[PDB]
Design a protein around this nucleic acid. Structure first.
Ligand SMILES: [Mg+2]
Lengths: 1212, 134
DNA sequence: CGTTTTGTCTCGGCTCCCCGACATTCTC
DNA sequence: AGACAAAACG
């Protein structure tokens, strides 16, 4: 009879909901509720998640975290270098004096920026290595370049000199820190590729293109030759860009089995491709036959203008740096005794590893060379273990009792599919599933070739020896051939055939000098474990050699065979090893099968089943299936399902169906939901908010009472993912426990389709209601445009229908410009009974009569459907006109964070490494505190600075975007002069003047545009801006960094009122909010400087009510008599800046037309949002607005007698 | 160089002459124009009217005299209650003492002079209590 | 003061866990 | 590409 129907419409970031109490048989009913919950998301996210471009906050956070981690580890390396050098007594005294070595080890003393080589005496900085500088000047004079060079270039001269000459120890420390600065490229795995691995960057010229007579696509493809005598692998069509062209490729050569190079080709662009640039630099350095340091030094001797960092050497293999540093250290160890003092080596080891005796002892066998390169500078940590994240077996658990007196379950991790046990399991499964067919008559020819256990033993024996099987091999096995038979699987497909043992046996065969019985099952498992667990080159070789020693095998060809074993692919099975070991005995047959190999419980179950006795753990379906398993010997060659049931007693996964009896179950489900559990964050957010809204509706309209919701309908309108998961989760609320309702989804869940929704909407006139609702916006747009193209008269209905001109019809849709259409769709869905969906999804009847009954019951006479009840249109209009859109808010600023770090704790007289928690209150800032660009502060006398504003200058590249107006914003005046002169010489056209060719010409001839006075080349210029930028920090040089507020961080907008009545407005910076919330205070100060009391603070997505001009809302309240007029005066905050706060009416989703700088028109002017109301009064919203509070279901909250009473009733 | 505040007990010891040395010390503090919190003034008024039963007229006149010439009242800070709640979790004192400390700190007071507040204790790394009479 | 315009950190390598969609064979 | 935050323009 009476049915509560809940219709849901789910969008990408919107949730429309409707709840109705319908009595369809009597054509009665009424709309109990309607609404829409909105999750704010920028259009960029909506347009990017379709294609996918790092569309995730979590990914961005991880990126920042990785950057920070690299920075911190570099700092740690520097500090350890400082400590070691200070103990070694190498640092200069003035430098060492400013470094803490007692509490903050190795770090610089607070508010200090010491420089190793520049000594500050009475405010004057002097270079430390004068004689080395003189030597470098002598070398430069010999090269005949110039005698005036920066002092810091001496680093490279020392780097060259250290290779074969003695240098001062301070110079060595400078060199070592310089090496620490630049480490180079390196890959953890290594795995030196093809010995040739040519990968040589070469530049070739095309000699000729003999048309190869390869006519393709109505054109004959030409070949290519290179002066070296090489033919391009690929053919060419466009001859213009190939003839006698100097191209550069990255060619790979491999010695083919025939004994010749299989040269490949790959086109690259130097100075644009990472690999090309890197390989070119590596080849250039190698050809010089000298270390990178001296290469840089000589390139600097030849061209004193050379850019080194970022231009000459960007990135190169770490081997270059390691070799140079090893050479330098080895040479200097011959001169400085401190590098040979074992006492000093021990002292440094204790300094670094006072609490790690094991590592101390290990290092005691090494020397300073190893300590400097291998342990300090070039130590790269290995990857973290991901084994903890592996899935868990669905069958085997363990139970244990913790210190809390509870009994909880530990899980068993799945088995790596490379495991021999899994290989055997898979091979047996494939064997059982195999069955042959004859080509001619397609009959089940099997049972004639695999009919006795001997045949199956033969097949298993054959399969073991292989690593893969195919049609031909399997057919040939039985002596059968292709021309008559097939094997029931993909005729041309191959299947895994125990490749693990194969490869192991093949590499064991190549070793020779061993009897052909060494490889036993136990040895096979041991070898697989060795290969799988020791994933490290040095560790792997040591393990190999050790294994070859313990087993009396000559370790000469063994490691050669196994040193290049391909690592196993990362993939795991459904079950663990324990379950597979249990299931194999049942699956095996023949000599591989033996009764004693079945565990005690499974043997007991076997005895029970053969006996036919009664056990509660054995179902009737069992004896139905196990009728044939009369005797123990029938327990052979059992398929997966039979053995699974026998071992564990469940016919696979039977599910639990479940049923929630109240909102408590749903809220528990929500509480225990895990993050990142679904496809992507967007669907997860939508689903979780949908569940929360459903819980709120349940509590409000049914008190969470059991089976309150008679039926739930769902619609979506990529997004398909949330179609089935949500239905499955919500089946727990609308299920029936009588046994009739069984399946993946409850029969009461009735997914719809767009066809039913649209056809109901058109037949039911809800389209007319929507058009009427949205029309006033279209008359407003008409007035704004002073035209009549946004509204079209129609005579069939004798009214204006909204419309848009063709030029503004790119992607316009009348529905998406609001938030209430979601609720309209929800309402439409909620009244669509199962009959409607069946009728409109299977309208094909095969006979008019059988579906005529549904036609009559649901369609007026087939023209239109009957309304759910007489006043449906009126009710829908009245409800839709009174829907407040509820917006989710994210106002996180600070949140507590927990830090656990490794540390040596002293317990029971022993030092043991464990994770200690960080003490004190450590907050985590949950917003970006500032934009990334950092600008310096400048004072230009020739520009006026109004009080409260400052000038900040940042470097910019000189390009075509520099006109006279822009050229007027450069801090330097000589640059302004030269740029103006150059631009004038170029007809005042920046496109021509400041093109790369123009810039090159200008740098060549800077004399002619600077009165003939010389001038350094110009590549970047500091442009200034006048504004309000705050310092990044307050320590060190951070006071010299000025930044702007990050996007979407003006979250608070304070409104105060003085005794008189006038209002004051302010925007609180995120920083001030951070301190205020850290102190336990409110985000917004409760009083301004003038002492005006704080009326309230506004944040984005907050809802305010703007009273009419005549209305005097001072103590109004009474927020229950909300009619269309009142709701029509509800606005939502969008953005804030200074004293400006922008608003958009709550029911507006997308503008009819946005703003374009050319036409200069928009629904809400240039900002796509207004500081004033859209109505003709056009009143300042902030001048008379009053904040309101709405819940998830869009009901306003206002203090009441009961509310006040409860406020301190809770405390009573 | 350091803003200095006082509690009721300082002015009471000034007002009391049973203890010549302590009265002298308290008067010595007052020669430095120390800051003070309005709640100190109100509590002083209450104690004056209850323990000493002094006339309302005389107490008001002395309050006006001291606030005009010797000490400086501190404007009540609207963030006193929120901060006091913040201080309560980490600090277990009388809510009156917590309020006094809250207002003193909110006014950048660097030293608070009092006895019954566990002398030498630092409140949120911003204000160290000093016991002067020792 | 009210409105529009403008600028906004960017690029490389590699490995190891998880989920889902679609196909194929088999079983219940 | 998008939309905020603020300079910049009247
Ligand atoms: Mg007190």
């Amino acid at each position: 009879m009476i049915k509560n129907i809940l219709g849901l419409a789910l969008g990408t970031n919107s949730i429309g909901w409707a709840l109705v109490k319908q009595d369809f048989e009597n054509k009665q009913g009424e709309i109990l509720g309607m609404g829409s919950r909105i999750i704010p998301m920028s259009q960029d996210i909506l347009g990017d998640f379709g294609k996918g471009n790092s569309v995730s906050q979590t990914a961005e956070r991880t990126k920042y975290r990785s950057v920070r981690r690299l920075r911190e580890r570099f700092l740690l390396r520097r500090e350890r270098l400082h400590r070691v050098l200070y103990i070694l007594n190498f640092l200069p005294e003035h430098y060492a004096s400013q470094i803490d070595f007692e509490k903050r080890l190795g770090k610089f003393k607070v508010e200090t920026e010491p420089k190793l080589v520049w000594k500050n005496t009475d405010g004057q900085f002097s270079f430390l290595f004068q004689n080395s500088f003189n030597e470098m000047l002598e070398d430069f004079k010999a090269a005949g370049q110039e005698l005036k060079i920066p002092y810091d270039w001496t680093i490279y001269h020392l780097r060259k000199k250290a290779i074969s000459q003695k240098i001062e120890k301070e110079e060595l420390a400078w060199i070592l820190l310089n090496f620490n600065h630049k480490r180079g490229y390196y890959q953890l795995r290594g795995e030196d590729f093809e010995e040739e691995k040519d990968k040589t960057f070469v530049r070739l010229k095309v000699d000729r293109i003999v048309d190869s007579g390869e006519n393709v696509k109505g054109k004959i493809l030409y070949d290519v030759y290179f002066e070296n005598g090489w033919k391009y692998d690929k053919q060419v069509v466009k001859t213009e860009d190939w003839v006698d062209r100097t191209k550069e490729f990255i060619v790979s050569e491999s010695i083919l089995k025939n004994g010749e190079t299989k040269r490949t080709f790959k086109a690259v662009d130097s100075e644009k491709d990472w690999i090309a640039i890197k390989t070119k630099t590596e080849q250039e350095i190698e050809h010089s036959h000298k270390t990178v340091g001296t290469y840089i030094y000589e390139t600097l001797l030849q061209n004193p203008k050379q850019k080194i960092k970022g231009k000459l050497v960007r990135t190169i293999e770490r081997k270059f740096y390691k070799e140079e540093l090893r050479q330098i250290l080895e040479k200097q160890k011959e001169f400085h005794q401190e590098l040979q003092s074992d006492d000093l080596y021990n002292d440094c080891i204790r300094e670094l590893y006072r609490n790690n005796e094991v590592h101390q002892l290990t290092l005691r066998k090494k020397d300073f060379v190893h300590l400097f390169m291998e342990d300090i500078i070039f130590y790269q940590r290995p990857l973290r273990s991901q084994k903890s994240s592996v899935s868990n077996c669905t069958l085997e658990f363990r139970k244990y009792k913790g210190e809390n007196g509870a009994e909880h379950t530990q899980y068993l991790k799945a088995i790596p599919k490379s495991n021999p046990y899994y290989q055997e399991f898979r091979l047996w499964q494939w064997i059982f599933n195999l069955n042959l067919y004859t080509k001619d008559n397609d009959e089940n020819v099997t049972k004639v070739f695999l009919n006795t256990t001997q045949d199956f033993e033969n097949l298993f024996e054959f399969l073991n020896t292989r690593k893969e099987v195919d049609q031909k091999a399997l057919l040939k096995h039985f002596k059968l051939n292709e021309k008559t038979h097939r094997w029931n699987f993909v005729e041309d497909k191959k299947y895994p055939c125990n490749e693990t043992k194969t490869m192991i046996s093949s590499r064991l065969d190549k070793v020779e000098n061993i009897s052909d019985d060494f490889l036993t099952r136990d040895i096979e498992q041991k070898i697989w474990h060795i290969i799988y667990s020791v994933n490290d080159k040095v560790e792997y070789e040591k393990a190999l050699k050790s294994f070859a020693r313990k087993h009396h095998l000559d370790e000469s060809s063994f490691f050669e065979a196994f040193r290049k074993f391909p690592p196993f692919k990362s993939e795991y099975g459904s079950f663990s090893e324990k379950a597979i070991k249990k299931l194999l005995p049942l699956m095996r047959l023949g000599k591989y099968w033996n009764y004693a190999e079945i565990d005690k419980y499974s043997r007991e179950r076997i005895q029970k089943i053969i006996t036919g006795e009664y056990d509660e753990n054995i179902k009737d379906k069992v004896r139905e299936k196990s009728v044939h398993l009369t005797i123990e010997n029938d327990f052979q060659g059992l398929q997966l399902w039979l053995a699974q049931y026998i071992v564990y007693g469940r016919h696979s996964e039977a599910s639990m169906i479940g049923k929630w009896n109240s909102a408590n179950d749903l809220e528990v489900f929500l509480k225990d939901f895990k993050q990142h559990s679904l496809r992507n964050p967007i669907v997860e957010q939508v689903i979780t908010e949908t569940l929360r809204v459903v819980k709120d509706i349940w509590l409000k309209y049914g008190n969470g009472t059991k089976d309150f919701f008679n039926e739930i309908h769902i619609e979506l309108g990529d997004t398909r993912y949330i179609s089935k998961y949500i239905s499955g989760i919500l089946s727990n609320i609308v299920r029936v426990e009588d046994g009739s309702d069984e399946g993946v989804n409850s029969k009461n869940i009735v997914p719809g389709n767009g066809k039913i929704t649209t056809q109901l909407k058109q037949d039911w006139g809800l389209n007319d209601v929507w058009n009427d609702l949205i029309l006033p916006r279209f008359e407003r747009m008409n007035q704004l445009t002073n035209s009549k193209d946004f509204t079209a008269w129609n005579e069939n209905h004798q009214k204006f229908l909204p419309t848009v001109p063709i030029e503004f019809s790119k992607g316009f849709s009348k529905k998406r410009i609001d938030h209430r259409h979601h609720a309209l769709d929800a309402l439409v869905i909620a009244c669509a009974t199962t009959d409607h969906v069946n009728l409109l999804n299977n309208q094909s009847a095969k006979s008019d009569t059988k579906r005529y009954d549904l036609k009559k019951k649901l369609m007026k006479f087939p023209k239109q459907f009957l309304k759910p009840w007489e006043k449906f249109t009126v009710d829908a209009k009245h409800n839709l006109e009174s829907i407040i859109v509820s917006f989710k808010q994210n106002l996180r600023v600070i949140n507590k964070a927990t830090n656990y770090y490794e540390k040596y704790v002293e317990k029971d007289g022993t030092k043991n490494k464990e994770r200690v928690e960080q003490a004190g209150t450590n907050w985590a800032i949950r917003k970006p505190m500032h934009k990334d660009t950092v600008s310096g502060k400048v004072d230009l006398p020739w520009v006026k600075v109004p009080k409260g504003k400052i000038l900040t200058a940042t470097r910019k590249s000189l390009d075509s975007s520099f006109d006279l107006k822009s050229i007027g914003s450069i801090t330097d005046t000589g640059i302004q002069k030269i740029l103006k002169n150059y631009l004038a010489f170029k007809d005042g056209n920046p496109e021509l003047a400041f093109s790369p060719e123009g810039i090159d010409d200008l740098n060549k001839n800077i004399e002619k545009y600077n009165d003939g006075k010389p001038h350094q080349p110009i590549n970047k210029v500091r442009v200034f801006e006048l504004g309000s930028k705050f310092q990044v920090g307050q320590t060190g040089n951070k006071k010299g960094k000025y930044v702007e507020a990050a996007k979407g961080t003006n979250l608070f907008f304070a409104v105060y009122e003085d005794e008189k009545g006038k209002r004051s407005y302010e925007t609180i910076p995120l920083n001030e909010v951070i301190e205020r919330q850290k102190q336990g205070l409110t985000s917004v100060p409760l009083e301004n400087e003038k002492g005006s009391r704080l009326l309230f603070d506004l944040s984005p997505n907050d809802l305010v009510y703007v009273p009419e001009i005549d209305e005097n809302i001072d103590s109004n309240f009474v927020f229950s008599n909300l009619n269309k007029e009142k709701i029509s005066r509800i606005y939502k905050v969008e953005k804030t800046s200074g004293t400006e706060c922008y608003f958009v009416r709550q029911d507006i989703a997308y503008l009819i037309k946005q703003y374009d700088a050319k036409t200069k028109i928009g629904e809400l002017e240039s900002q796509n949002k207004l500081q004033v109301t859209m109505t003709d009064d056009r009143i300042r919203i902030t001048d008379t607005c009053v904040k309101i509070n709405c819940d998830r279901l869009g009901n306003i909250n206002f203090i009441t007698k009961e509310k006040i009473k409860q406020i301190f009733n809770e405390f009573r | 160089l350091d803003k200095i505040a006082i509690d009721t007990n300082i002015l009471l010891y000034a007002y009391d002459n049973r203890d010549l040395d302590k009265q002298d010390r308290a008067v010595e503090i007052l020669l430095k124009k120390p800051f003070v919190t309005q709640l100190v003034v109100f509590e002083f008024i209450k104690v004056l009217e209850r323990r000493f039963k002094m006339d309302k007229k005389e107490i008001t006149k002395l309050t006006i005299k001291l606030l005009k010439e010797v000490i400086i009242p501190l404007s009540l800070h609207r963030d006193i209650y929120n901060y006091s709640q913040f201080l309560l979790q980490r600090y277990n004192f009388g809510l009156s003492d917590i309020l006094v400390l809250s207002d003193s700190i909110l006014n950048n007071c660097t030293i608070l002079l009092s006895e019954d507040m566990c002398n030498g204790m630092i409140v949120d790394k911003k204000l160290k209590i000093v016991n002067p009479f020792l």
